[model samples]
Target: FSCNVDGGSSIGAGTTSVYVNLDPVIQPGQNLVVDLSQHISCWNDYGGWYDTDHINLVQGSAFALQSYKGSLYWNNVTYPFPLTTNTNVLDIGDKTPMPLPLKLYITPGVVIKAGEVIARIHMYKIATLGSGNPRNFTWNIISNNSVVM
Candidate 1:
């Protein structure tokens, strides 16, 4: 699967959620390339108690409950799947420390920019129960810079 899927533009007020839709026809072992032109951001309502959202590959057929850990490669260097370089990967367990190492294959002739911001955002809450009327959410995006293959 070597194609690019644009996430379009303006997904959030100060943040954006980009995703890649994989063709159901393609099996699991196939190779994929996702090019990101945004910087990575870490968000948490609390401190280290809550880790930021990591990358993932969700199966459309199944609900969001079922998803595979996606690997990230920068400048031909693979940062294992289920990225844990920043923090822990387990959402619920014995609280034991486990590294999020995603397993996957990579092809040759691929390049990625290092030291670049892939995405950014902070955590916030929207209140509708206190002194607020029915409100809809909107956002203004400056540009859309992402590709999936």
Candidate 2:
């Protein structure tokens, strides 16, 4: 995954990227756009690997959902907070980008190779801009509250 300030550059948050700081400092009311894309191919037709199921993004308390959008891979971009469903599944992975015309210019200059972007997440910075150090928001792939599965 990666993020930017819309007009700013991108910073990867994956394992290859240990730490990175964005170009411009995000201010209050400004959106912190995040894009989630597959590294290469997620699964295969008969590779035996389990395909990507529902993704749960447990957000931090400092940020709130402003809006969201997605690539054509998914049926819809509506994540509804923690649950990510309505997938396009398709062939289950490799040979996924068959349409060929699927253009995924996620963020400013980032682009997916043959896979489609899962979605571009937007979060509204809700931390108090008081004096002292700036608050850093975070996210989890799991959930906190005991919501029924």
Candidate 3:
């Protein structure tokens, strides 16, 4: 349901991020859905003030995931709320010292119930890094095609 990373300062210099990946293999023409219903609370703002970044989702068969980037505000060395897909990118760095916990809920729709699917969440720290190093995580299988009444 959740995971964490300890890339240290590498995450600040555009190195690591909290990424997610699915298992088996996600193909094209499949209905893949990502629901970030959780939040990232207690963001200490470890690196510094707020900065801009991008969170991307790459499906094995679907088009490249778009970036959901935004800014964040620190409240006494803490993030206001948990991180969600709505605010994928946080402007703050690790310098502030906040939990910045990311709460999310990813539920796959019925359409993608047939084949295997892989969901990888990537964070692009800088626009110039080209292909920045992203922290990787994964998901299990969802193979049930029955609608009981």
Candidate 4:
């Protein structure tokens, strides 16, 4: 699935969180493979540069509903996904003109039960004055395969 955001303000910083729910949930012995490559892009009106302060992947639990659990992949490494903290940084230069897209893949194992929320993708943005540009983010499910016994 793909999501787009409009940078409505000129001078400010903010965070956006989008939830992707797997309806009917993912059954056991299956894998959720997501390709975040070319996932995010930003355009500036005045040819200004924006900073992607942080990007994070947070997982949700079935029991608590509000609580987050599970793991995520960043640059090919798996780490305990955090809800309140940032996972990675891309301190792109001021003259960068656009947000560089990421080539990260998030593969969550099917340890999660059925009918549970899967994951949330969080993106933080910081912009300079007079810069209003539309941003686009795309996420593709590369595979949803069941494990062979």
Write candidate 3's Cα lDDT for 4-89 as tens digits. Answer: 24323322322122333333344433333332222221222223433322333222311122232222232222121223432234
lDDT of 1 by residue, 95-143 (tens): 2222223223222111212223332212222322344121222111112
Write down the TM-score for model 3. Answer: 0.27
lDDT of 1 at 80: 50
CA-RMSD of model 4: 8.4
Error of 1 at 102 (Å): 16
TM-score of 1: 0.27
Model 4: per-residue Cα lDDT over 13-132, one tens digit each? 233322222323454434444333333343333332333232333332111223434455553455554434544544333332343343322233344444333344444433333442
Candidate 2: segments with Cα more than 4 A from true spot = 1-24, 38-41, 45-75, 84-149
User: TM-scores for all candidates?
Assistant: 0.27, 0.28, 0.27, 0.38
Model 2, position 145, has a per-residue lDDT of: 20
Question: In model 4, where do residues sit more than 4 Å from their true spots?
Answer: 1-27, 43-69, 75-77, 82-84, 92-117, 128-149
Those runs of model 1 whose alpha carbons end farther than 4 Å from true positions after fitting are: 1-14, 19-21, 37-67, 87-149
Kindly list the per-residue Cα lDDT of model 2 for residues 1-149, writing each as its tens digit: 22322123442232212121122333333333232232211222223323322122223211112232322222333333323443222232232322211122212222211122223322212111233121122321111122111
Candidates 3 and 4 compared: the better one by lDDT is: 4
Candidate 1, residue 108: Cα displacement in angstroms equals 21
What value does the lDDT take at residue 50 in candidate 2? 36
